[PDB]
Amino acid sequence: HMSAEVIHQVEEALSSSELTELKYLCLGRVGKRKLERVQSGVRDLLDILRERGKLSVGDLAELLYRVRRFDLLKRILKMDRKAVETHL
Known about the structure:
mainly alpha; Death Domain, Fas; 6 helices; protein binding; DED1; cFLIP
């Protein structure tokens, strides 16, 4: 379902630090925000975690819900945050 374009958009929207937070959001359930600079194709870890099973289709969707990033929720998932909830 989700491809490189999806996780690319995630990298564009969320900051490098927030992308690290996604890792910990999957692992330790850490949902902290980090108003930092975004990357334009640098955090390859995102692809590693995607294949690993930490940023999978379902997992990433949940993570982005918990982050509440509407720039992704209504672009990647193309639906309201609440609508996403019902798919979790």
